[PDB]
Amino acid sequence: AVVKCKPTSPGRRHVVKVVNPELHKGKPFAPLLEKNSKSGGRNNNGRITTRHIGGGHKQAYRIVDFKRNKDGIPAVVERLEYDPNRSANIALVLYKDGERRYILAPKGLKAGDQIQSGVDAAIKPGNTLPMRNIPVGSTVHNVEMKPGKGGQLARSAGTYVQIVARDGAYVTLRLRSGEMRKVEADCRATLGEVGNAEHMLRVLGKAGAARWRGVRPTVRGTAMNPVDHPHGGGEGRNFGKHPVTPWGVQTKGKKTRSNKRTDKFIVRRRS
Amino acid sequence: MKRTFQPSVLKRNRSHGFRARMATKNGRQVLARRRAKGRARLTVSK
Amino acid sequence: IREERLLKVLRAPHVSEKASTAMEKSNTIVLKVAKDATKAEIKAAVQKLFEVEVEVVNTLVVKGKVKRHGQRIGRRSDWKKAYVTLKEGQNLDFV
RNA sequence: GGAAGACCAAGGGUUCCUGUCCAACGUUAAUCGGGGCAGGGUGAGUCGACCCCUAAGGCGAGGCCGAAAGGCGUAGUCGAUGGGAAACAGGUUAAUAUUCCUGUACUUGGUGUUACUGCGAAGGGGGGACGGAGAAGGCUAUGUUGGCCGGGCGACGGUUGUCCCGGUUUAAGCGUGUAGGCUGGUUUUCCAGGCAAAUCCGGAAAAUCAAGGCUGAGGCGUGAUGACGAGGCACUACGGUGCUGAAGCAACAAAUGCCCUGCUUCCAGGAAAAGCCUCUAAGCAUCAGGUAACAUCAAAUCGUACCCCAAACCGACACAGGUGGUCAGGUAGAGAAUACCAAGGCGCUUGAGAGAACUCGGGUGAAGGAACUAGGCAAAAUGGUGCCGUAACUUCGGGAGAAGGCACGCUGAUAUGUAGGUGAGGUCCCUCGCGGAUGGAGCUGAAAUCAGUCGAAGAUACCAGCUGGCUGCAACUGUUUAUUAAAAACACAGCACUGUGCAAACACGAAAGUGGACGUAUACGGUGUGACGCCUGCCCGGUGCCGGAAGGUUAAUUGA
RNA sequence: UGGAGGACCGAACCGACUAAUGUUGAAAAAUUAGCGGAUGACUUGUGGCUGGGGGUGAAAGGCCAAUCAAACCGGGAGAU
Ligand SMILES: [Mg+2]
Ligand SMILES: [Mg+2]
Ligand SMILES: [Mg+2]
Ligand SMILES: [Mg+2]
Ligand SMILES: [Mg+2]
Ligand SMILES: [Mg+2]
Ligand SMILES: [Mg+2]
Ligand SMILES: [Mg+2]
Ligand SMILES: [Mg+2]
Ligand SMILES: [Mg+2]
Ligand SMILES: [Mg+2]
Ligand SMILES: [Mg+2]
Ligand SMILES: [Mg+2]
Ligand SMILES: [Mg+2]
Ligand SMILES: [Mg+2]
Ligand SMILES: [Mg+2]
Ligand SMILES: [Mg+2]
Ligand SMILES: [Mg+2]
Ligand SMILES: [Mg+2]
Ligand SMILES: [Mg+2]
Ligand SMILES: [Mg+2]
Ligand SMILES: [Mg+2]
Ligand SMILES: [Mg+2]
Ligand SMILES: [Mg+2]
Ligand SMILES: [Mg+2]
Ligand SMILES: [Mg+2]
Ligand SMILES: [Mg+2]
Ligand SMILES: [Mg+2]
Ligand SMILES: [Mg+2]
Ligand SMILES: [Mg+2]
Ligand SMILES: [Mg+2]
Ligand SMILES: [Mg+2]
Ligand SMILES: [Mg+2]
Ligand SMILES: [Mg+2]
Ligand SMILES: [Mg+2]
Ligand SMILES: [Mg+2]
Ligand SMILES: [Mg+2]
Ligand SMILES: [Mg+2]
Ligand SMILES: [Mg+2]
Ligand SMILES: [Mg+2]
Ligand SMILES: [Mg+2]
Ligand SMILES: [Mg+2]
Ligand SMILES: [Mg+2]
Ligand SMILES: [Mg+2]
Ligand SMILES: [Mg+2]
Ligand SMILES: [Mg+2]
Ligand SMILES: [Mg+2]
Ligand SMILES: [Mg+2]
Ligand SMILES: [Mg+2]
Ligand SMILES: [Mg+2]
Ligand SMILES: [Mg+2]
Ligand SMILES: [Mg+2]
Ligand SMILES: [Mg+2]
Ligand SMILES: [Mg+2]
Ligand SMILES: [Mg+2]
Ligand SMILES: [Mg+2]
Ligand SMILES: [Mg+2]
Ligand SMILES: [Mg+2]
Ligand SMILES: [Mg+2]
Ligand SMILES: [Mg+2]
Ligand SMILES: [Mg+2]
Ligand SMILES: [Mg+2]
Ligand SMILES: [Mg+2]
Ligand SMILES: [Mg+2]
Ligand SMILES: [Mg+2]
Ligand SMILES: [Mg+2]
Ligand SMILES: [Mg+2]
Ligand SMILES: [Mg+2]
Ligand SMILES: [Mg+2]
Ligand SMILES: [Mg+2]
Ligand SMILES: [Mg+2]
Ligand SMILES: [Mg+2]
Ligand SMILES: [Mg+2]
Ligand SMILES: [Mg+2]
Ligand SMILES: [Mg+2]
Ligand SMILES: [Mg+2]
Ligand SMILES: [Mg+2]
Ligand SMILES: [Mg+2]
Ligand SMILES: [Mg+2]
Ligand SMILES: [Mg+2]
Ligand SMILES: [Mg+2]
Ligand SMILES: [Mg+2]
Ligand SMILES: [Mg+2]
Ligand SMILES: [Mg+2]
Ligand SMILES: [Mg+2]
Ligand SMILES: [Mg+2]
Ligand SMILES: [Mg+2]
Ligand SMILES: [Mg+2]
Ligand SMILES: [Mg+2]
Ligand SMILES: [Mg+2]
Ligand SMILES: [Mg+2]
Ligand SMILES: [Mg+2]
Ligand SMILES: [Mg+2]
Ligand SMILES: [Mg+2]
Ligand SMILES: [Mg+2]
Ligand SMILES: [Mg+2]
Ligand SMILES: [Mg+2]
């Protein structure tokens, strides 16, 4: 339920919030939780290696199963939960034998849905399987790049991958970025899409909101002094140079991808 | 107003205390220099 | 415990108005004891050396004062004080 | 007097208390002191530290890495600001007291007996265990009045009365199980998910019962024939000592404290680990070990004085500055603002005169009312509660407290105190109780209307908006040049470009590694712009970036 | 009925808009009278982390011990 607010105060005005009424109100499933500490975007030298991070509300790490490797054993969806650790929602599911696991919550999923994973599984959303057993052209998420490693691709809300080719050991995917990539057919994937696709709609409306999300302010380079940035001071408002990162590398159009390892896999760039 | 020295014991001793010096090469060089100048007390200890 | 240690515990009777007060009124004596002795060893040592019955021993440590002698700043040594409770039974006296 | 009081933590380290002294110290004298000299003073199983357990973070055997020193990190091992057993009232010192004394308790361990008995962990599972906001019901601390008890008839009119003053205090514990919150219960069979095992956890299936369990403020009872207690009676070195000791209840109001780590709701989704409960593996089986009652022993060590809204800490000073936590009396008041007082603490360590100019901080002002000046700078004025009323414009919320106006004291009646709030006695019921209904004594107590009355003035003090019209810039709350700049600067939600396929770009590291992220293109980084609304036109010649490989050109290399 | 908000008025608390006094100060940045925020991008306690060809910066070249367009201390060093 994507909803605007009546503007009872200037901050509240532009706020669009997304209310999913189907979400579980009340505590997560404890045995599946972990401790998580915010790093302030700082490495083991205490320096800031990534700017604009910190503050933010406290979060607990939900342990989500990306390998989906408990096999041929049906499991049913108990409830949908909010995961602070990621865009998407999650599902708390119960395998027949008495085990519970969290998973990414795919679209069309709701309390009561039977799902299952293995080589044999039926094709319906929320089911997982190695991809040579997947109909070509089908839509999937939570895709592995190496067999048994666990899902990496299309974990965000509303994202998904289309399988456009099966050749020998390699299936070719149309990635969400628009880039054709080969992946070995033995990597499990999951049917449907990631749900809560309306995540992207929601508007913060006020700086404070962004600050809850662990995002600190961003100082425009050309505002700083010439010593701090290449973009540098001037008298009043002055630019004069081609745009660069704070470390001087050219931005706005320069390709920074360099790997020669992973090249044989990539068919074509996104455009 | 609020001046620069706001004392704390635990702070004082973790920062400059004997053991804190001895932890490192540099610190033991401090304690070397002091023992060579012949101080009354090397570090800050009670 | 060994007796050899014992005879080394108890330095001296502590003399003062508080002392006299407790000795008369509550049946308790006051001792300067070695800085390191403990309630066990003082209980033992009185019970042994004065041969009378100790109930309980409470203790404290006195920090010596700081003095000046001829501009020089010295520090009087620390020491340990012990309030030693005797049961109403014994009567210890001064001849 | 929401402190200039009382108690801590920090920090100090003897400044504490007594005697004695007055050179120096104390902005003066000082007989006094936080000064000098001497003595005394800090009493713990249950308050803290230690200790048990972990957070961020640190160190880190092996290990990876690095010219050397060294960097990173695994098993570990440290690290509280967090989690972990238990004590209260009264009495006492010149100075300690939750420690000493009186009484009354409590906890955890060791040994012992006795009765019973499947006990065992670094492994398993529960528990511990967690946000913001809100709501309001139950209470208590506490206070006010009345009853009660002791004393009082009072320097000046009046005061044997509906009169005046003072007291009306009592804890942990132990027994009880209430307002409230949470949750179906019990029995049986199966399943292997819980790294091995499981009778425990989770899962499935029947059977059966409806009350069951868990939690819980406070009340009541005991604790307590005790203590405390106004005072009185004896002695006193006039500092005190000893004896005796009345009443010791009730109604009402009431927290920000407790019930409540609860309940309702929101999204930004809200520590870890041990004690603690249970399940078993290796094991051990009449041993061991566990459970209960009685006896018995132990509970070590260190801190404890005094100062902490400061003359004792941080400011060179006995410095108009700075310093976290706790307690929270009265009348008025929305109130922890304010004004005046209580408990309690102080009069700020040079006075004494005089009553000029001038400076400082104020008070008042004829007539005028911004004519002052860079500028209404400063001053004055506004100021409260209820009711009436309120524009352009608008993003429909606002603007708006717009503007402007009206009543406001006291006394009486409606009512010798109403509406409400609380709810005794009685009668009835009861699954009999801290129960239910009825019941209305007492107690508390707004608001209004009408009639009167005082004053120049009733929001009489302190307290407590100046308002309106036009326009620049910035949407907005925020942030900033500690110490001359708070803005029109910065950020901002949003918008766009662009980079990045995960061993991500990028960043920090000669490297290992780490952050990005236990994220995954609805993600992440970088640059610009900066809500919303309307829009974002032309130019690729210049520099840049992206694509192209044909030719021309060119490095090491090879050596004709 | 409900109780949203970088909502409103307003003390503690946080801050520093104006004026005067102070300028060998009561103070090496204060006081007095007014002023802004005051449920949050708030505020504060204890502990930890980042180290100078560096940090950190809602960005003023601000901040890093009353010293910052490159801290402090010892050295080269009797620099020139
Ligand atoms: Mg670390
Ligand atoms: Mg960023
Ligand atoms: Mg995150
Ligand atoms: Mg931005
Ligand atoms: Mg600038
Ligand atoms: Mg810099
Ligand atoms: Mg530059
Ligand atoms: Mg500029
Ligand atoms: Mg210009
Ligand atoms: Mg004792
Ligand atoms: Mg002790
Ligand atoms: Mg000595
Ligand atoms: Mg006041
Ligand atoms: Mg401190
Ligand atoms: Mg201390
Ligand atoms: Mg002294
Ligand atoms: Mg004194
Ligand atoms: Mg004296
Ligand atoms: Mg003098
Ligand atoms: Mg004099
Ligand atoms: Mg004299
Ligand atoms: Mg003295
Ligand atoms: Mg304790
Ligand atoms: Mg650690
Ligand atoms: Mg090593
Ligand atoms: Mg290390
Ligand atoms: Mg430890
Ligand atoms: Mg410690
Ligand atoms: Mg602690
Ligand atoms: Mg503790
Ligand atoms: Mg005292
Ligand atoms: Mg456990
Ligand atoms: Mg906690
Ligand atoms: Mg909640
Ligand atoms: Mg009461
Ligand atoms: Mg009478
Ligand atoms: Mg109940
Ligand atoms: Mg008496
Ligand atoms: Mg409160
Ligand atoms: Mg409080
Ligand atoms: Mg004490
Ligand atoms: Mg004390
Ligand atoms: Mg203070
Ligand atoms: Mg005080
Ligand atoms: Mg001082
Ligand atoms: Mg003075
Ligand atoms: Mg002072
Ligand atoms: Mg303060
Ligand atoms: Mg008051
Ligand atoms: Mg009132
Ligand atoms: Mg007064
Ligand atoms: Mg008084
Ligand atoms: Mg005082
Ligand atoms: Mg004047
Ligand atoms: Mg005037
Ligand atoms: Mg006039
Ligand atoms: Mg006039
Ligand atoms: Mg006029
Ligand atoms: Mg003139
Ligand atoms: Mg003029
Ligand atoms: Mg003015
Ligand atoms: Mg005025
Ligand atoms: Mg206007
Ligand atoms: Mg009347
Ligand atoms: Mg009445
Ligand atoms: Mg009534
Ligand atoms: Mg009623
Ligand atoms: Mg009149
Ligand atoms: Mg009138
Ligand atoms: Mg103009
Ligand atoms: Mg602005
Ligand atoms: Mg604009
Ligand atoms: Mg502002
Ligand atoms: Mg400034
Ligand atoms: Mg200023
Ligand atoms: Mg590099
Ligand atoms: Mg690397
Ligand atoms: Mg991480
Ligand atoms: Mg982006
Ligand atoms: Mg701009
Ligand atoms: Mg071009
Ligand atoms: Mg071109
Ligand atoms: Mg090119
Ligand atoms: Mg402050
Ligand atoms: Mg500031
Ligand atoms: Mg002020
Ligand atoms: Mg204010
Ligand atoms: Mg405002
Ligand atoms: Mg305000
Ligand atoms: Mg904090
Ligand atoms: Mg800042
Ligand atoms: Mg400085
Ligand atoms: Mg430098
Ligand atoms: Mg330089
Ligand atoms: Mg030279
Ligand atoms: Mg020279
Ligand atoms: Mg020369």
Numbering used by the authors:
A (entry chain C): 2 to 272
B (entry chain d): 1 to 46
C (entry chain U): 2 to 96
From the paper:
The SRP, consisting of a hairpin-shaped 4.5S RNA (SRP RNA) and Ffh protein (SRP54 homologue in eukaryotes), then binds the RNC78. Using cryo-electron microscopy, we present structures of the co-translational-targeting pathway intermediates and a complex with Sec translocon at resolutions from 3.4 to 4.3 Å.
Our electron microscopy reconstructions reveal two states of the RNC–SRP complex. In one state, SRP RNA and the M domain of the Ffh are ordered, whereas in a second state, we additionally observe the NG domain bound to the RNC. These structures were refined to 3.8- and 4.3 Å resolution, respectively. The SRP forms three contacts with the ribosomal surface in the vicinity of the nascent polypeptide exit site, in agreement with low-resolution studies. The NG domain binds close to ribosomal protein uL29, positioning the G domain in close proximity to the tetraloop of the SRP RNA. The interaction areas of the NG domain with the RNC approach the mean resolution of the complex (4.3 Å) and are established through NG loops 1 and 2, which clamp the N-terminal helix of uL29 and contact the C-terminal tail of uL23. The interactions include highly conserved residues mediating both hydrophobic and electrostatic interactions in agreement with previous cross-linking and mutational experiments. Taken together, the interactions of the M and NG domain with the RNC and the positioning of the NG domain in close proximity to the SRP RNA tetraloop indicates that the NG domain is in a state that primes it for the SR binding.
